[PDB]
Design an enzyme around this catalytic site. Structure first.
Site, mmCIF file in Angstrom:
data_model
loop_
_atom_site.group_PDB
_atom_site.id
_atom_site.type_symbol
_atom_site.label_atom_id
_atom_site.label_comp_id
_atom_site.label_asym_id
_atom_site.label_seq_id
_atom_site.Cartn_x
_atom_site.Cartn_y
_atom_site.Cartn_z
ATOM 1 N N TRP A 159 14.537 52.772 9.549
ATOM 2 C CA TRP A 159 13.983 52.903 10.984
ATOM 3 C C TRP A 159 14.839 51.814 11.803
ATOM 4 O O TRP A 159 14.704 51.555 12.992
ATOM 5 C CB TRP A 159 12.454 52.521 11.086
HETATM 6 C C1 LIG Z 1 6.270 53.081 16.552
HETATM 7 C C2 LIG Z 1 6.040 52.430 17.954
HETATM 8 C C3 LIG Z 1 6.886 52.057 19.014
HETATM 9 C C4 LIG Z 1 8.335 52.221 18.870
HETATM 10 C C5 LIG Z 1 6.919 51.353 20.277
HETATM 11 C C6 LIG Z 1 5.303 50.848 20.609
HETATM 12 C C7 LIG Z 1 4.125 51.537 19.832
HETATM 13 C C8 LIG Z 1 4.431 52.409 18.386
HETATM 14 N N1 LIG Z 1 2.696 51.214 20.308
HETATM 15 C C9 LIG Z 1 1.529 51.455 19.763
HETATM 16 C C10 LIG Z 1 1.099 50.889 18.415
HETATM 17 O O1 LIG Z 1 2.101 50.489 17.721
HETATM 18 C C11 LIG Z 1 -0.016 52.029 17.598
HETATM 19 O O2 LIG Z 1 -1.042 52.390 18.730
HETATM 20 C C12 LIG Z 1 -0.572 51.562 16.631
HETATM 21 O O3 LIG Z 1 0.131 50.757 15.550
HETATM 22 C C13 LIG Z 1 -1.309 52.733 15.654
HETATM 23 O O4 LIG Z 1 -1.963 52.114 14.540
HETATM 24 P P1 LIG Z 1 -2.427 53.174 13.224
HETATM 25 O O5 LIG Z 1 -3.043 54.494 14.094
HETATM 26 O O6 LIG Z 1 -3.070 52.113 12.540
HETATM 27 O O7 LIG Z 1 -0.945 53.527 12.776
HETATM 28 P P2 LIG Z 1 0.174 52.242 12.189
HETATM 29 O O8 LIG Z 1 -0.061 51.108 12.468
HETATM 30 O O9 LIG Z 1 1.376 53.123 12.163
HETATM 31 O O10 LIG Z 1 -0.428 52.344 10.587
HETATM 32 C C14 LIG Z 1 -0.597 53.188 9.480
HETATM 33 C C15 LIG Z 1 -0.580 52.734 8.132
HETATM 34 O O11 LIG Z 1 -0.815 53.888 7.250
HETATM 35 C C16 LIG Z 1 0.072 53.713 6.212
HETATM 36 N N2 LIG Z 1 -0.057 54.988 5.389
HETATM 37 C C17 LIG Z 1 0.483 56.449 5.920
HETATM 38 N N3 LIG Z 1 0.469 57.168 4.974
HETATM 39 C C18 LIG Z 1 -0.134 56.849 4.229
HETATM 40 C C19 LIG Z 1 -0.558 55.188 4.233
HETATM 41 N N4 LIG Z 1 -0.936 54.373 3.332
HETATM 42 C C20 LIG Z 1 -1.511 54.724 2.008
HETATM 43 N N5 LIG Z 1 -1.121 56.152 1.811
HETATM 44 C C21 LIG Z 1 -0.819 57.108 2.717
HETATM 45 N N6 LIG Z 1 -0.595 58.571 2.399
HETATM 46 C C22 LIG Z 1 1.303 53.074 6.827
HETATM 47 O O12 LIG Z 1 2.386 52.827 5.885
HETATM 48 C C23 LIG Z 1 0.926 51.908 7.895
HETATM 49 O O13 LIG Z 1 0.984 50.791 7.381
HETATM 50 C C24 LIG Z 1 2.296 50.166 21.405
HETATM 51 N N7 LIG Z 1 1.253 49.346 21.531
HETATM 52 C C25 LIG Z 1 1.072 48.054 22.212
HETATM 53 O O14 LIG Z 1 -0.096 47.618 22.410
HETATM 54 N N8 LIG Z 1 2.241 47.900 22.848
HETATM 55 C C26 LIG Z 1 3.465 48.167 22.647
HETATM 56 O O15 LIG Z 1 4.408 47.702 22.935
HETATM 57 C C27 LIG Z 1 3.788 49.642 21.855
HETATM 58 N N9 LIG Z 1 4.959 50.201 21.832
HETATM 59 S S1 LIG Z 1 5.264 51.475 23.436
HETATM 60 O O16 LIG Z 1 4.613 50.978 24.479
HETATM 61 O O17 LIG Z 1 6.446 50.787 23.734
HETATM 62 O O18 LIG Z 1 5.601 52.697 23.194
HETATM 63 S S1 SF4 Z 2 12.998 47.092 6.071
HETATM 64 FE FE1 SF4 Z 2 15.244 47.303 6.136
HETATM 65 S S2 SF4 Z 2 15.529 49.261 4.975
HETATM 66 FE FE2 SF4 Z 2 13.329 49.235 5.222
HETATM 67 S S3 SF4 Z 2 13.210 50.542 7.188
HETATM 68 FE FE3 SF4 Z 2 13.178 48.420 7.825
HETATM 69 S S4 SF4 Z 2 15.613 48.102 8.291
HETATM 70 FE FE4 SF4 Z 2 15.485 49.850 7.172
#
Ligand SMILES: [C]C1=C([C])[C]=C2C(=[C]1)N([C][C]([O])[C]([O])[C]([O])[C]OP([O])(=O)OP([O])(=O)O[C][C]1O[C](N3[C]=NC4=C3N=[C]N=C4[N])[C]([O])[C]1[O])C1=NC(=O)[N]C(=O)C1=N2[S](=O)([O-])[O-]
Ligand code: SF4
Ligand SMILES: [C]C1=C([C])[C]=C2C(=[C]1)N([C][C]([O])[C]([O])[C]([O])[C]OP([O])(=O)OP([O])(=O)O[C][C]1O[C](N3[C]=NC4=C3N=[C]N=C4[N])[C]([O])[C]1[O])C1=NC(=O)[N]C(=O)C1=N2[S](=O)([O-])[O-]
Ligand code: SF4
Ligand code: SF4
Ligand code: SF4
Lengths: 642, 149, 642, 149
Positions: free
Chosen positions: D47
């Protein structure tokens, strides 16, 4: 996505170069290529000329005909060997009207007057053609005949091999760039490539080069993006290699904006031709409406195109688009009602056509029959959903994108001869460089038979060119060495920056082939009238596409490859990117919507026969990195009237 | 996409070349030199053309429809011969269809490219005629097409 | 696509079971969950009750707030701590109108009278709230306040850990199914799950269960299908787990057809709230037209909704869709003109708002800042493209899909209490089972503050429920063992059929989680009003969707997994598919188009207040495998006028 | 998606837990016991929330924009402290921006959940009041909402 099992890396300096000298070099061993090899082998004897065929895969099954075909889409029949005889004038008219009034009639009539001979040879060589009790070739529609063509390619491959000789056929060698004459900036001298089976750089020196690489697919995001990213209606194997090397050399392109959107069975993309023409199958929207009829009024505005018979392909697509825009999907091909009506209550008759129905898929697009099986769809009981696929760029089918090529002396008018330094049939604007099949633009509806035929035409012209002009270009070793370095650069870049990340495919200094392709596909899909906007686009979108393609082209200089397979994928990507740029610039140049159903310019929604009934021809100057465009007014060459 | 059955693949080690690797139009089939067995190296680039499937002498290759739209269970199995090909289409629900189509009316490798054609000549090289014309076309004369006045 | 480095396989019978007995079990440690843990710990002391919190990842950063947030979208301000004071009546009116007339006002008014207190606590705990020189909370729009929320989750997480104790928080444990009372078919008794860090099966026995799993994302194909498939606007971590287990338990769903389509910066999906409300940014099409102006008249048909202020979000989206269909893209967020206007020539003032601009992105969706960086986009010089993303299903944001829950005794009318065996705030139709945040439907616009608040409300109710009803649920050991086998079946299936193919991911006897997901997304995208049809659909499309989902559901029985990570992915898929089916069935049931901009029923294009001003509630019976639908007429609970 | 720089990653020396693997909301970060270095196991599920990047005491994790729409060259680097966080945004064209934002006004781990709150009672358990109410709301009494006549 690609995850190599193991590396296979080489540095340019450590790869051995193999030099091959020949007179005629044919790049691509598909249908047009095999046609060129076959015919060239015949005339080459007049001068003891050497003919060489280079194919990236294996000629036995390479190209668009890998699965075989269920029909031969172009067979005029001037003597009555089929259920329906036709005239050449009627055919030329048919093609021009289908292209919405734009087609090089000198080129179209040229291949059409030769095509039947090619078909007859195909049968002589073993191709099983469907025949009636009386012994006539079974017609599908007016111009096609049904064939048991599972081995269609292997047969044509055998002919080409017998003709040119196996020692003159190089398989598993990928051509990524052309070589020009060191002393003439507008003459070809050969081409460079590399093996995908071993570390070997190829340098082909030739007097004439024939581009037969097929069209370009995967430029746009398909309707399926997972494994099915591989399920494109057209040959996934063709990636616009000819377009790239030819345009880079300065050969002028034509009608490159004219893509082709095929209406096919949904997801599997099986063919609809036999179902529409042979089985008299009806296509209806989700509410049982036959839109070809309910949308007939919308075609009236196109004159005389909207009143032609059959309805031009793009307009047929336009009618389905209107249904899709109104949200009347799913669209169905009522095979169940088609088989019942054709059988007429005769159960034995039903069984016969039921088998014919399945052969139509098992002979050219098995995926559709597999789709039917996996989804428990029995064509005699329930209908199948159909939909238009993403755009494809080619000139052998219903699209006419490709290189501007010279026509025969007896048919080509002076209006079309202006841009050619040498007037040889099918030669490009670059002396010594010919283009055929998907690679030759402005003369569509060639298909299997037509492409092989166009190859024969360029081949004879190529022998004539060599014996008459006695070409003798010299390659530039300095350039060759630069190209060799570029060829394996991706592998060297991988080794150089892989240590920046613990993950091979997540690096800040390079993109892998599949990564660049996903990006290309997203750009084209969202800005170049792809499926994402229902084939719609405008100046602004197109300009943004050029900006995004520019970013992508720059990043191509940072491509990485982990093995020979991916190295080829790398160059296939490069080839697609430039092809896509040409397509975008071409659509931006033409300010009209001549092919609604293929694409719509929302800012110029009408067809303009007052200022755009012309061929759009462009040229790319590598040294100046500039594109120049020009309009060549269409002129009717063959006698015919609406 | 295509996939290899371990129990059936012998790596073509009793042949001069690897059938699947040789035939694939997209360079997907390769050998895992560890197992000495083939595998599709890039399935999402498979066109499902069945070339590998048809050329595998051990009948070790089959096709499992793309996961994007294919429910499990379906299959199309070919048995390619010299003059014809057999297909067995098996449905997810258990239905089995069988078909047989011709693929060639002549022996393999029997093509004589220019049989009956006269030798090419310098004079003929300057005309619009291709090898074997105008007769291969079926007409005694070269087809004419009316040019627009 | 997932390619595990190595295998991590376990057979069910080799996996040790850990039994955890508690009184209140909270599933999901996000914002609503932490709200529940905090409040529950307070009242639990009355009975010495044990409160347990189970989270699949780590509470410190889990859920939608992982990156933090740039504002608190819900703060009424009943005293004047911010730049603008509001009344509860105006809030209720606002929400109901935004929902185009359908919202459980008893539920909305209830969280609204509690939300401000929660916000005040957030500030007490360390949340830095943007303040004016006068010390007032800086307003974004009318209902939101800006915050320096990078550590919004860690801070709220700390409150919950401090409140319930770290010994009562189970992390890295994925809950996949609920357990019902052996003694009562419509009462909850706990839940089962497994660890994603070690071979360990969990059985949580509890008297009360609170669903706080967040909504569901990745049901539909995104606009980016490569790596960016991970760039969903909403939390990619939430996969409809609560929806699945609750519905499987028999708890009734409501307004599940009400998805949310977010209009955001293109591709990166950065927030537009601050830009629109705070910076006064205008959104214009490719030709410079401010479409909220040019498309105002088209909202005239949605009286009085279309004449409401602010204009209902779906109607704002509808204006965007009209532009998209006319092909007037790209749509631009003119940040450059906003910044100049706001700075008024003052360079220091520009610097200040310029930092605020980037913080709006760096505090909640860094990808957008990264996108600008990668594309060389300077918000002060050039505008950015905006676009609507694919559909998401949740009940805390602008969408109101989730379980039908009971409201407070002092606000819920008789018309809304009918389906509840027990009347406890936020309890589902299943006894002892509560739903909060995204899981509680019919009362949207909770956002961060409101979700935490609703969690508090349910937690106190759960304690009251326990002390008043004194439940003693008994789990069925026979069902538990069945579930344990199912839990690891994917791993056992992999081991049993992997030898059928030389490739782990191309097998005829099973599908991997990523393969089933791609299929789910394609089905929903093409038939359930996804981006593919510009959010359009009809009875036929929906019916075909159920057919394809049925195939996919059956194949879920042939799911495989190569490690613990993928095993979670497998169940996340299972959760999504059922959520998908419910969404489809709900859309099919409601015969109208009440929220154009979110989705269109082309077969029932109009809004019907004569027959559909009601909540659509459904229940799934696992024993009979039948879905039953019911219409609950909307009644205005709070006093207000358009 | 995120990626680990081998040169800076130490598989989390002798600390009690692997920061990146512990923090990831989608279970993407994991250790390669062989190299003793971390990596994102499923990047297309990232993400890009930067949680791992922020919690890596070695600053061995960075983010490379999704290839689908990101040209190479951009980067956002965070340096999170206790009361504020600093950001350096580097453009593909070399442009470099620096920001610093507050993230907390109180010491970490200093929260007293029910500070000043009265003890809960069975009677109060039956009201609509939540912990700390109606005091924390700031109003002169529990907020009243007018019911539709
Ligand atoms: C994503 C997003 C963006 C990019 C922006 C924004 C938003 C979002 N907003 C809204 C808030 O953040 C909401 O409303 C809240 O957070 C909802 O709460 P909940 O329903 O509690 O949900 P979360 O936090 O996500 O949590 C859940 C928990 O669970 C877990 N898991 C799942 N599946 C499972 C589990 N565990 C055991 N087993 C199983 N199977 C996960 O892992 C987690 O930890 C907003 N708001 C305010 O206020 N401000 C702002 O700024 C915002 N943003 S907009 O406006 O831009 O659209
Ligand atoms: S922590 Fe690091 S590897 Fe895990 S969703 Fe966030 S940016 Fe990607
Ligand atoms: C795909 C397809 C389908 C499915 C169907 C169909 C079709 C298709 N069709 C058509 C045909 O096929 C065509 O036209 C032809 O083929 C074309 O030709 P060309 O152009 O030649 O070609 P191809 O074949 O593809 O080939 C090419 C080649 O080349 C190569 N390469 C590439 N690149 C490269 C190379 N090499 C070296 N280097 C480089 N770079 C490839 O590999 C190959 O080999 C048709 N037709 C008829 O007739 N019929 C029918 O039926 C058909 N089908 S439809 O109807 O549907 O249409
Ligand atoms: S052709 Fe068949 S036996 Fe030979 S390597 Fe390929 S799969 Fe194995
Ligand atoms: S089915 Fe065709 S494309 Fe796929 S691997 Fe086999 S030969 Fe190659
Ligand atoms: S937190 Fe940093 S040092 Fe520790 S394992 Fe992860 S990346 Fe390597």
């Amino acid at each position: 996505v690609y995850y190599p099992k193991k590396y296979e890396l080489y540095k340019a300096d450590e790869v051995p170069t193999e030099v091959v000298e020949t007179d005629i070099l044919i790049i691509g061993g598909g249908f047009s290529g095999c046609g060129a090899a076959y015919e060239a082998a015949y005339w080459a004897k007049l001068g003891g000329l050497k003919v060489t065929l280079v194919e990236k895969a294996a000629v036995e099954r390479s190209g668009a005909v890998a699965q075989g075909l269920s029909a031969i889409n172009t067979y005029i029949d001037l003597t009555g060997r089929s259920e329906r005889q036709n005239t050449l004038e009627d055919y030329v008219r048919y093609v021009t009207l289908d292209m919405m009034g734009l087609a090089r009639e000198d080129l179209v009539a040229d291949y059409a007057r030769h095509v039947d001979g090619t078909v007859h040879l195909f049968e002589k060589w073993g191709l099983p053609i469907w025949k009636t009790p009386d012994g006539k070739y079974v017609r599908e529609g007016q111009w096609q005949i049904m064939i048991h063509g599972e081995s269609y390619k292997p047969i044509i491959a055998e002919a080409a091999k017998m003709a040119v000789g196996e020692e003159n056929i190089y398989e598993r060698v990928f051509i990524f760039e052309l070589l020009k004459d060191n002393n003439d900036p507008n003459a070809v001298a050969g081409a460079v490539g590399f093996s995908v089976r071993e570390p070997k750089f190829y340098v082909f020196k030739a007097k004439a080069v024939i581009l037969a690489t097929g069209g370009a697919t995967l430029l746009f995001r398909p309707r399926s993006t997972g494994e099915a990213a591989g399920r494109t209606w057209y040959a996934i194997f063709d990636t616009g290699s000819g377009y790239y090397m030819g345009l880079k050399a300065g050969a002028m392109l034509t009608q490159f904006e004219h893509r082709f959107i095929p209406f096919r069975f949904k997801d599997g993309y099986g063919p609809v031709g036999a179902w529409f023409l042979f089985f008299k199958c009806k296509a209806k929207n989700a509410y049982g409406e036959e839109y070809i009829k309910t949308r007939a009024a919308e075609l009236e505005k196109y004159k005389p195109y909207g009143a032609a018979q059959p309805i031009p392909t793009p307009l047929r697509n336009h009618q389905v688009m209107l249904e899709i825009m109104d949200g009347n999907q799913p669209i169905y091909m009522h095979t169940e009602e088609a088989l019942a009506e054709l059988a007429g209550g005769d159960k034995k008759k039903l069984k016969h056509i039921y088998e014919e129905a399945f052969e139509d898929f098992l002979d050219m697009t098995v995926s559709q029959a597999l789709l039917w099986a996996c989804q428990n769809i029995d064509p005699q009981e329930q209908p199948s959903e159909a939909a238009p696929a993403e755009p494809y760029i080619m000139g052998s089918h219903s699209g006419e994108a490709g290189f501007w090529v010279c026509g025969p002396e007896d048919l080509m008018p002076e209006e079309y001869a202006k841009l050619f330094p040498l007037k040889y049939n099918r030669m490009t604007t670059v002396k010594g460089l010919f283009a055929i099949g998907d690679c030759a633009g402005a003369n569509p509806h060639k298909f299997s038979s037509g492409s092989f035929t166009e190859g024969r035409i360029a081949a004879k012209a190529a022998v004539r060119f060599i014996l008459e002009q006695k070409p003798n270009p010299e390659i530039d070793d300095a350039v060759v060495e630069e190209l060799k370095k570029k060829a394996y650069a991706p592998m060297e870049r991988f080794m150089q920056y892989k240590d920046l990340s613990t993950a091979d495919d997540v690096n800040p200094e390079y993109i892998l082939p599949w990564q660049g392709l996903v990006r290309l596909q997203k750009i084209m899909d969202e800005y170049a009238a792809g499926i994402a906007t229902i084939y719609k686009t405008n100046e602004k979108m197109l300009q943004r596409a050029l900006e995004l393609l520019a970013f992508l082209k720059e990043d191509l200089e940072k491509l990485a490859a982990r093995d020979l397979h991916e190295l080829m994928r790398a160059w296939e990507l490069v080839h697609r990117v430039w092809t896509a740029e040409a397509h975008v610039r071409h659509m931006l140049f033409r300010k009209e919507t001549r092919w609604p159903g293929y694409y719509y310019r929302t800012d110029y929604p009408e067809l303009n026969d007052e200022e755009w009934k012309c061929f759009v021809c462009s040229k790319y100057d590598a040294e100046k990195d500039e594109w120049t465009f020009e309009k060549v007014p269409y002129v009717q060459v063959i006698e015919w009237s609406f | 996409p295509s996939f290899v059955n371990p129990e059936k693949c012998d790596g073509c080690k009793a042949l001069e070349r690897t059938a699947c690797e040789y035939i694939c139009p997209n360079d997907l089939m390769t050998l895992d030199k560890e197992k000495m067995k083939a595998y599709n190296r890039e399935p999402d680039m498979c066109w499902e053309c069945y070339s590998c499937v048809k050329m595998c002498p051990q009948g070790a290759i089959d096709v499992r429809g793309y996961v994007d739209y294919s429910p499990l269970g379906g299959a199309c199995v070919p048995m390619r011969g010299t003059s014809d090909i057999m297909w067995t289409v098996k449905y997810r629900n258990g239905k089995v269809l069988r078909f047989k189509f011709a693929i060639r009316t002549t022996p393999w490798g029997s093509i004589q490219p220019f049989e009956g054609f006269p030798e090419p000549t310098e004079e003929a090289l300057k005309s619009e005629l291709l090898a074997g014309e105008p007769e291969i076309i079926g007409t005694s004369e070269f087809p004419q097409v009316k040019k627009k006045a």
